[PDB]
A paper describes a structure:
Cells protect against this through pathways that include ER-associated degradation (ERAD), a process in which incorrectly folded proteins are ubiquitylated, marking them for extraction and subsequent degradation by the proteasome. ERAD requires specific E2 and E3 enzymes, including a conserved soluble E2: UBE2G2 (humans) or [name] (Saccharomyces cerevisiae). These E2s are recruited to the ER by membrane-embedded proteins. Here, we identify the putative E2BR domain in [name] Cue4 and present a 1.7 Å resolution co-crystal structure of this E2BR in complex with [name] [name].
The peak was pooled, concentrated and subjected to sparse-matrix crystallization screening. After refining the crystallization conditions, a crystal was grown that diffracted to 1.7 Å resolution in space group P212121 with a single complex in the asymmetric unit. The C-terminal end of [name] [name] continues as a helix until residue 213, making it the longest contiguous helix of the three E2BRs. The [name] [name]–[name] complex buries a surface area of 2423 Å2 between the E2 and [name], as calculated using CNS. Three [name] [name] residues that interact with [name] are structurally and genetically conserved in the two other species: Lys192, Ala199 and Arg200. Superposition of E2–E2BR crystal structures on the structure of a cross-linked Ub E1–E2 complex reveals potential steric clashes between the N-termini of H. sapiens G2BR or [name] [name] and the Ub-fold domain (UFD) of the Ub E1. While [name] [name] appears to interfere with E1–[name] binding, it presents no obvious structural impediment to [name]–E3 RING domain binding.
Numbering used by the authors:
A (entry chain A): 4 to 170
B (entry chain B): 173 to 214
The structure:
């Protein structure tokens, strides 16, 4: 009961007053706990011009626990696992994965929100978090050969956008 | 964002579909302009 009420409230807020660059919501309201997202790559980054599909999966006791977030396309970023799972501190309650994130980083709580999650993803795309390495190849390249990192990201962004069609 | 959330499931689902479509079509249109710039250079 509480989770569906809260998810509807966030969906309404995102639809009516959400940030530019984000579309997110339940495409099928008979599965309200699965949201499709489209995330626009931030301007001024090698992700500029990319448009990235992602899935949010909410637990049945939301907002008491965080959703998971996965990109649904090939993705090359230090904080995104090769399977698409996004590694950011806001998706973990305090105490979970202490070796991965700065302790100054925001953690999951019931007053966090989908909008905050997705704004945090945008921020991570522009500025990777150097403590929470998830993709070792992208971590190395971003730190030691940023020009080549940008080249990889741009090439993948064009490739996956070419595979993105409305459905 | 700028549409009021509709009052029925089917209307909400259609509005969301349309919003995704619009975002995808705009991104593909931007990329087409970038590609044409590059194809010109070759
Ligand atoms: Mg449907
Ligand atoms: Na569901």
């Amino acid at each position: 009961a509480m989770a569906l009420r809260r998810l509807m409230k966030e969906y309404k807020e995102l639809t009516e007053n959400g940030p530019d660059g984000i579309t997110a919501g339940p495409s099928n309201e008979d599965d309200f706990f699965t949201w499709d997202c489209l995330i626009q790559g931030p301007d001024g980054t090698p992700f500029e011009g990319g448009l990235y599909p992602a899935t949010l999966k909410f637990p049945s006791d939301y907002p008491l626990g965080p959703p998971t977030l996965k990109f649904e396309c090939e993705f090359f970023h230090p904080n995104v696992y090769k399977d698409g799972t996004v590694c950011i501190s806001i998706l973990h309650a305090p105490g979970d994965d202490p070796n991965m994130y700065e302790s100054s980083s925001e953690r999951w709580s019931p007053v966090q929100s989908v909008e905050k999650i997705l704004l945090s993803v945008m921020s991570m795309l522009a500025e990777p978090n150097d403590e929470s390495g998830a993709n070792i190849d992208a971590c190395k390249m971003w730190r030691e050969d940023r020009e080549e990192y940008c080249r990889v990201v741009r090439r993948l962004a064009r490739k996956t956008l070419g595979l993105l069609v409305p459905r | 964002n700028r549409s009021k959330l509709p009052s029925s499931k089917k209307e909400r689902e259609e509005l969301f579909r349309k919003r995704k479509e619009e975002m995808i079509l705009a991104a593909r249109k931007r990329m087409e302009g970038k590609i044409k710039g590059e194809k010109q250079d070759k």
